[PDB]
Write a protein that binds this ligand. Structure first.
Ligand SMILES: [Mg+2]
Lengths: 507, 136
DNA sequence: TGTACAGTGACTAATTATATGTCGTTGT
DNA sequence: ACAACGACATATAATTAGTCACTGTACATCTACGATACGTAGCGGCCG
DNA sequence: TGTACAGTGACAAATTATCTGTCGTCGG
């Protein structure tokens, strides 16, 4: 290869040598050039042989030949190899696994071996630091390494399969994951609840935020189903959100890309994906999915750090007043966060581009305007019970609840596919297999509960209590084990009440 | 000044885009360089002595005839192409009264005591502009 | 006036690759 | 006779190991645990 | 090619207290 070297910051001594060399650039004659050397021996206080060496160092190296080169020992240690290997490997072994041995502690191991070997000059602690110095800088550098980024309109998302998804247009690849927000919220009475969970759905091509879910609720394939319908459907917000632009963003993904959480690697999201026709894809590392993750730092920096009750990004940065200074309810935080996403965030510049907004790039990036799906057809969100069988008397029994259906007595002994809503299990949609296809059969209803609404976590909590209470299984008996615990509080029920009040304001 | 010196010294190798007819064949280290510590370092690095008239013809034969002549649009690159074409195929192909037979280029060539050997490109890196800090 | 250990500027001693003379040798 | 290069000896700051006074920051209850999913096994009721 | 917002080097322009001329005034 090519091998060049250039001098810099030359002057401090070297300008005197440079002026000597400038006076000597030409062998004018054998008589005169010797006189020029013997004259230069007045500017440098040195013999003819020192000036002849200077001229040879200049002619063979150029300007660096004026500068004094560093000694051959620079960076080598005089303590001998035994001690240099003992010190290096002792450090490394002592920082193996969970151990975090300090150089001082390494020096103690040096004095201990020197005592065993009857040495008299075990390296001093100051020299231990020096010997370990280079392998500490490396560690600090290896943490600090920057990565460039996608540049221009071309983007290839890596999966856990080693396949890359080429992101060609708007709604080609959506992405999703969850996080805690960093604000403690209060109930409608001003008492502490908990820090909400935020879900975001993003389109990869435009980086526009295509939908959210905010709530005290837990990450679940239900919260993902709700984030999906909010992303897919056309969006409506009332004047109490004070929006000055529209979240005009909707339609159905071709692919959905996620971390490996049990919300996403689930049969429920598989069934949603098969019915909507989108393919579920797995993120290979957290560092591949920055389009999901980075909305979250921006929101900490642009929104949540400026709100009362802020908790910091971690426990070492927690404002000590966070538990006393909380003020917002979930309905206030959503009314702030939705505004932020519609008026600010989707209207800001797409950073890869510099000359489009995130929304402008999404809208112009559709291959065609997609048709709005009917709100009833989002019943593909309903969970599937795969292999329950019809009992004689036209009956289905399910999470203790017993169901009756309009044609269902025709199919006693047969196997049926049941589609249901975890928010309301009073009613079941019954499908059956015919010609190796599902066909709709009937809207079965929990007998004697046709006037009544049970969510699955209520029927489940009532069943747990009923099992442990030792009472019999029936549709009312389960309702009886709800209505007391309803009427008679526990943080999850208090959270659920505030979350419900937000869902009411959605209607 | 150091960038103008670098060009002068190195081989030219201009692109097809300049649509030149003649080759700009000069290259090489001088014995002296006259100018308007840095240039004196460069002189000491390269081995020549630093000391501390085409303009009449550039005005009359080129620049007074161009778009935007300050008494239409023209980019810096276009002006360079025009300037090089003028230099390589006209100005250095001209014959002065004191030369008679030979052009500015031919007399240059004709007067060399020997064909110099090209300075490898890297030895001229000291001329180029510098940004002092970047992170890999 | 919390409290005491590990890391850090500031200075010094031992070791060494390096700059300087001086002379011998060779080329011009 | 003048200039350049090597042999040999001699003095020298750069480098490293060591010592010392001043200072930074942890000790001050605290992440194993909660919330989802799948995958497999079990309990008695109903039928042969 | 992970990612995108806030903080940070590097450079340019308008404003003002500060340094320089030139002259006038006063003292030795
Ligand atoms: Mg995740």
């Amino acid at each position: 290869l090519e091998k060049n070297v250039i001098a810099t910051q030359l002057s401090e001594e070297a300008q005197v040598k440079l002026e000597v060399i400038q006076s000597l650039l030409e062998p004018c004659d054998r008589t005169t050039y010797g006189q020029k050397l013997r004259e230069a021996a007045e500017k440098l206080n040195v013999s003819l042989r020192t000036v002849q060496r200077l001229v040879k160092n200049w002619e063979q190296d150029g300007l660096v030949g004026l500068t004094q080169t560093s000694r051959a020992d620079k960076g080598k240690h005089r303590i001998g190899e035994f001690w240099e290997n003992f010190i290096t490997k002792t450090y490394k072994e002592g920082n193996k696994g969970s151990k975090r041995m300090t150089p001082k502690q390494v020096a103690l191991r040096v004095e201990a071996k020197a005592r065993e070997l009857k040495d008299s000059k075990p390296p001093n602690y100051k020299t231990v630091l020096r010997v370990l110095a280079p392998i500490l800088e490396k560690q600090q550098k290896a943490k600090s390494i920057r990565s460039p980024g996608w540049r221009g309109t071309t983007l290839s998302v890596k999966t856990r399969e080693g396949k890359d998804l080429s992101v060609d247009y708007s709604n080609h690849v959506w992405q999703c994951d969850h996080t805690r927000v960093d604000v403690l919220l209060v109930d409608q009475h001003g008492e502490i609840l908990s820090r909400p969970w935020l879900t975001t759905v993003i389109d990869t091509y435009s980086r526009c935020i295509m939908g959210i879910n905010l709530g005290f609720d837990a990450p679940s394939s239900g919260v993902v189903a709700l984030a999906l319908r909010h992303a897919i459907l056309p969006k409506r917000y009332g004047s109490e959100y004070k929006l000055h632009c529209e979240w005009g963003t909707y339609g159905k993904p071709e692919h959905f890309y996620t971390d490996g959480g049990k919300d996403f690697r689930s049969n429920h999201l598989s069934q949603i994906g098969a019915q909507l026709g989108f393919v579920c894809h797995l993120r290979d590392r957290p560092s591949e999915g920055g389009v999901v993750e980075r909305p979250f730092k921006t929101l900490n920096d642009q929104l949540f750090s400026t709100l009362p009750g802020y908790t910091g990004s971690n426990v070492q940065e927690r404002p000590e007043d966070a538990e006393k200074d909380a003020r917002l309810t979930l309905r206030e935080l959503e009314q702030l966060l939705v505004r932020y996403i519609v008026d600010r965030y989707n209207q800001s510049i797409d950073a890869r581009m510099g000359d489009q907004t995130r929304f402008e790039r999404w809208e112009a990036g559709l291959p065609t305007v997609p048709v709005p799906i009917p709100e009833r057809d989002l019943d593909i969100c309903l969970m599937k019970q795969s292999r329950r069988t019809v009992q004689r008397g036209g009956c289905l029994q399910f999470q203790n609840l017993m169901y009756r259906g309009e044609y269902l007595a025709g199919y006693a002994g047969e196997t049926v596919n049941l589609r249901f809503d975890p928010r309301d299990i009073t009613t079941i949609l019954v499908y059956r297999q015919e010609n190796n296809q599902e066909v709709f059969l009937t809207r079965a209803h929990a007998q004697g509960l046709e006037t009544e609404q049970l969510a699955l976590d209520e029927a489940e909590a009532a069943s747990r209590r009923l099992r442990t209470a030792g009472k019999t299984i029936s549709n009312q008996s389960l309702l009886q084990e709800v209505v007391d615990r309803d009427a008679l509080k526990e943080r999850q029920k208090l959270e659920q009440t505030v979350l419900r009040s937000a869902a009411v304001d959605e209607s």
